[PDB]
């Protein structure tokens, strides 16, 4: 039931629908994928399928990975990821070496898009966690963006684990739910997905048929 594809975020644009309403879309080049591997419950303990996406010079792949691809009889690709299926294999619907193109999805369906969000570096509490800070005037001394108190007093004489402080922000795995597929352009292998998609332009993206729908 669960359908998946791997692609690249190509940036956003806008289109007008039939109601003459503007629709902001993200162009995802859901390029062709190869299966390259099937996980069976009998052999691995769960049911899933690998997917190979992206072109790469064969000289850029080391001998072990090249051997893994040769075992599947497929030319090496840049990326490799597993699509997890329900705990029932059904022992069907996928063959090693089979091609997956963009029209596994249809117009008007909903998808889940997971990617790697943009990095923000070391971030303060005001950006990272939406703290308020103290005022800009009325005597405040060098605390305009500082966090304030971080605990109680002699009880407990510690800071609780999971207290929100400054640190590295971004580069996370992020899934956006219930995105409407506005158009499936099978000619260019392009999905026009209404909304925003995590990550930078040119980053690896996994598109899955939505489960909440």
């Amino acid at each position: 039931a669960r359908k998946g594809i791997l692609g690249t975020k190509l940036g956003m644009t806008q289109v007008f629908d039939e109601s003459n309403r503007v629709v902001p879309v993200t162009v995802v080049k859901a390029g062709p994928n190869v299966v390259t591997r099937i996980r069976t419950p009998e052999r691995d303990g769960y049911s899933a399928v690998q997917l190979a996406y992206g072109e790469i010079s064969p000289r850029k792949v080391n001998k072990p990975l090249t051997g893994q691809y040769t075992a599947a009889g497929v030319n090496p690709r840049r990326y490799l990821a597993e699509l997890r299926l329900d705990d029932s294999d059904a022992a069907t619907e996928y063959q090693v070496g089979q091609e997956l193109t963009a029209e596994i999805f249809a117009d008007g369906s909903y998808v889940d898009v997971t990617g790697t969000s943009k990095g923000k570096g070391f971030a303060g509490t005001m950006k990272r966690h939406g703290f308020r800070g103290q005022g800009a005037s009325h005597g405040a001394q060098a605390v305009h963006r500082r966090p304030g108190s971080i605990g109680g007093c002699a009880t407990p004489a510690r800071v609780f684990k999971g207290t929100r402080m400054a640190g590295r922000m971004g580069n996370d795995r992020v899934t956006v739910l219930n995105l409407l597929v506005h158009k499936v352009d099978a000619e260019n292998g392009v999905l026009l997905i209404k909304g925003a998609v995590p990550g930078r332009t040119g980053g690896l993206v996994m598109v899955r048929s939505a489960i909440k729908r």
């Binding site: 806008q14 007008f16 109601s19 003459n20 309403r21 503007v22």
Partner: protein, 121 residues
């Protein structure tokens, strides 16, 4: 438009300037746009008129300086913020409107104001 914003009254009830007390529409609602109901107080009134300085009224915003996006991707924007004082049944207390108003009142069901307005953009 938020609390403490001052508005120009766009009808002939006798008030010239109201001050926004509350933006109706839920707990801690922040801003009001075109078609939003407002609890206001009269700050300037025409001498010898219906309303008086210090009266608490209800009004609907019909013009706003900040541009509004429309579902087709267009935007509308006026030069001033304006409001129309209304009765509890969403009908104006005055007898005529001055200046243009936005289409959002049509969807917010202010048909009487829509019909009395000189122009609806």
């Amino acid at each position: 438009i938020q609390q403490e914003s001052r508005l120009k009254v766009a009808d002939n009830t006798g008030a010239k300037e109201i001050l926004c007390i509350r933006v109706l529409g839920g707990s801690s609602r922040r801003y009001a746009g075109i078609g939003d109901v407002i609890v206001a107080t009269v700050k300037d009134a025409i001498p010898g008129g219906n309303v008086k300085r210090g009266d608490v009224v209800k009004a609907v915003v019909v013009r706003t300086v900040k541009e509004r996006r429309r579902p087709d991707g267009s935007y509308i924007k006026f030069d001033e913020n304006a409001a129309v004082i209304i009765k509890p049944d969403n009908d104006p207390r005055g007898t005529r409107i001055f200046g243009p108003v936005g289409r959002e009142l049509r969807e917010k069901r202010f048909m009487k104001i829509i019909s009395l307005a000189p122009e609806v953009l």
